[PDB]
Amino acid sequence: FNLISEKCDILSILRDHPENRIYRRKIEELSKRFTAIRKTKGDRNCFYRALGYSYLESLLGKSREIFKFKERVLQTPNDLLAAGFEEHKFRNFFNAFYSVVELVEKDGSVSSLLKVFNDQSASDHIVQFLRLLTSAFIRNRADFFRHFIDEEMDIKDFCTHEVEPMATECDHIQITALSQALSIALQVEYVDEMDTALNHHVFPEAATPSVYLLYKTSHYNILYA
Ligand SMILES: *CC(=O)NCc1ccc(F)c(C)c1
Numbered sequence: 001f002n003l004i005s006e007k008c009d010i011l012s013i014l015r016d017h018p019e020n021r022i023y024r025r026k027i028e029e030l031s032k033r034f035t036a037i038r039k040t041k042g043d044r045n046c047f048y049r050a051l052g053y054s055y056l057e058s059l060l061g062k063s064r065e066i067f068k069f070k071e072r073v074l075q076t077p078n079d080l081l082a083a084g085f086e087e088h089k090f091r092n093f094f095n096a097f098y099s100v101v102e103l104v105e106k107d108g109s110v111s112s113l114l115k116v117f118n119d120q121s122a123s124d125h126i127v128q129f130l131r132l133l134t135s136a137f138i139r140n141r142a143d144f145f146r147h148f149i150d151e152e153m154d155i156k157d158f159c160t161h162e163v164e165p166m167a168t169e170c171d172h173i174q175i176t177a178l179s180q181a182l183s184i185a186l187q188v189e190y191v192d193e194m195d196t197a198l199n200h201h202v203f204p205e206a207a208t209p210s211v212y213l214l215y216k217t218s219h220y221n222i223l224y225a
Pocket of ligand 1: 041042043044045046047169217218219220
């Protein structure tokens, strides 16, 4: 379990911030709303790896939701082609993602899903797929991202340098784009060392979330309500 941990009690993360007044306060408050946490490896891929694992975990045993998600994933090659990606270059990454979706359907266990996400090869193929789909979704909707995020940004350069490469860190744009590309509703809780309220953001605004993440010390960990 070197990439995604076993479930732990929320208060077990006090030990990561010993004798720290603000972090203790915020973690205690978080424990009133959430029961458990899984930690992810801080290798620069932790947003993609956490969202992918936590969303597929949320589908286990839900036959209608699995059918609808599979239908969407089957169309994603067309998003990649429309943005200029070549089939022979994305094939291995698409096939790895479709495979883990079929595991959710056929096997249906937490333990089998966690083993794929802890297999460095399978897990990194899944992350690379998610990064290419993020990039495609932004490129195909460049006017949307310039209108609503930043009129001055260079969309093609941003995707080349800050989305496609492994180990590149995320901001609001990547989170919004992957949420929209796969129709995943997610809530991010923010824990920093300023003397401020524990607070959160939902993607898209106003949705009921499937996934909850904790953003703390530049890392995305998985929460359980
Ligand atoms: C999500 C992810 O892989 N984060 C890696 C990380 C951990 C600590 C930091 F200070 C940075 C810049 C990144």
